[PDB]
From a paper:
The EphA4 tyrosine kinase cell surface receptor regulates an array of physiological processes and is the only currently known class A Eph receptor that binds both A and B class ephrins with high affinity. Eph receptors are type 1 membrane proteins with an N-terminal extracellular region consisting of a ligand binding domain (LBD), a cysteine rich region, and two fibronectin type III domains. We have solved the crystal structure of the EphA4 ligand binding domain alone and in complex with (1) ephrinB2 and (2) ephrinA2. Structural analyses, drawing on previously reported Eph receptor structures, show that EphA4 in isolation and in complex with ephrinA2 resembles other class A Eph receptors but on binding ephrinB2 assumes structural hallmarks of the class B Eph receptors. This interactive plasticity reveals EphA4 as a structural chameleon, able to adopt both A and B class Eph receptor conformations, and thus provides a molecular basis for EphA-type cross-class reactivity.
The EphA4-ephrinB2 and EphA4-ephrinA2 complex structures were solved and refined to 2.4 and 2.3 Å resolution, respectively. To facilitate crystallization of the EphA4-ephrinA2 complex, a site-directed mutation, N174Q, was incorporated into the sequence of ephrinA2 to remove a glycosylation site not conserved between ephrins. As a result, only electron density corresponding to two reducing-terminal N-acetylglucosamine residues of an N-linked sugar at Asn42ephrinA2 was observed in the EphA4-ephrinA2 structure. In contrast, the JKEphA4 loop is very different between its two bound states (2.8 Å rmsd over Cα atoms of residues Ala150EphA4-Leu166EphA4); forming an extended conformation when bound to ephrinB2 and an α helix (Gln156EphA4-Asp161EphA4) when bound to ephrinA2. The Arg162EphA4-Trp122ephrinB2 stacking interaction contrasts with that observed in the EphA4-ephrinA2 structure, where Arg162EphA4 is involved in hydrogen bonding interactions with the carbonyl oxygen of Leu138ephrinA2, while Met164EphA4and Leu166EphA4 participate in hydrophobic interactions with Leu138ephrinA2 and Phe136ephrinA2. The structural differences between the two available apo LBD structures of EphA4 and the divergence in conformational changes that occur upon ephrinB2 and ephrinA2 binding are consistent with the EphA4 receptor maintaining a high degree of structural plasticity in its DEEphA4 and JKEphA4 ephrin binding loops. These changes include the introduction of unpredicted α-helical secondary structure in the JKEphA4 loop of the EphA4-ephrinA2 complex. Based on the high degree of sequence conservation in the JK loop across all A class Eph receptors, it is likely that this α helix motif is common to all EphA-ephrinA complexes. Superposition of EphA4 and EphA2 from their ephrinA2- and ephrinA1-bound structures, respectively, reveals that the JKEph α helix is well conserved both in structure and in amino acid sequence.
Residue numbers in the entry:
A (entry chain A): 28 to 203
B (entry chain B): 33 to 174
Write the structure that this text describes.
Amino acid sequence: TGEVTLLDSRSVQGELGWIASPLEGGWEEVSIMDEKNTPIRTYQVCNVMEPSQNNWLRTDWITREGAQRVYIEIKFTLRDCNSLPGVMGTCKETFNLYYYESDNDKERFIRENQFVKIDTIAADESFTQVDIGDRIMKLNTEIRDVGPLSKKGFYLAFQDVGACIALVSVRVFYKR
Amino acid sequence: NSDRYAVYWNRSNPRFHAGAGDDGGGYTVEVSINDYLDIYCPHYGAPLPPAERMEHYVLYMVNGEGHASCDHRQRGFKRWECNRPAAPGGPLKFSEKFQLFTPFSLGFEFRPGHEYYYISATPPNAVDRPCLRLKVYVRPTQ
Ligand SMILES: *[C@@H]1O[C@H](CO)[C@@H](O[C@@H]2O[C@H](CO)[C@@H](O)[C@H](O)[C@H]2NC(C)=O)[C@H](O)[C@H]1NC(C)=O
């Protein structure tokens, strides 16, 4: 592979230690059946009716070990706002990815304004009602990188601003 | 404004109406759109019973026919695995939001005034006879 995993959401045993803000009504843990009809934990939000969404989801602390350059692979489904009735003024088709470098293994609260934006993530294939009907996943894969990193580890965060999005998996790795 | 309905998925829960040879339809719960079902798998604390006696299940979402027959095959989707009856953290918990719109392409959508059905099978068996089963009725808009 030449890729060395630092975090994988799919391997996590049981529940993900991730913090959602707000705690309820924003990003919400949802357990599904994956490719191989085995269980994985996902986070999902679809507040496309109500305005001014600012839903945050933060991973736990991720060590960088000895790596300076790290890669963030996000796999997700994102709904086409035209496949949703009555939400033209509100529905979005992007979300934002952030990181925060930290020497501290276990900060309970990280302020949203401490996070540095990596990029706005858009979908190559938004899914529609034909896809829901036909059980066609339209899984998107997006990769971003951060570095050079200089602290023991970092936190990653995801900001939803009014999309209908399921984060199916998150994998963080370095290259050999 | 949402609320959650707890469903303890095990044979001792009289709301499934088991232990009688006639559950007469099984478990029935009424919910509104954007409400949740929290499903708690069978759980056992110390001192554990013999491993073979611990209830463990696969939960399926099925159509009416799957529900009536307790047989998921070609009648629905595997949803959740109750495969850790001795989990140290507590009961495995699975949640179902009765959303209008799904953010996940292979997730599920719900509509006012409609019925939805779930059943369990006990591995390695494909069908429990009688199975534990759940009918969810989503209230009409009002
Ligand atoms: C079977 O279901 C019953 C509920 O019908 C479970 O009992 C509940 O357990 C929860 C969490 O441990 C408690 O908060 C409640 O007080 C219990 N409710 C009642 C009405 O007794 C029981 O634990 C389940 N059995 C197994 C083996 O999982």
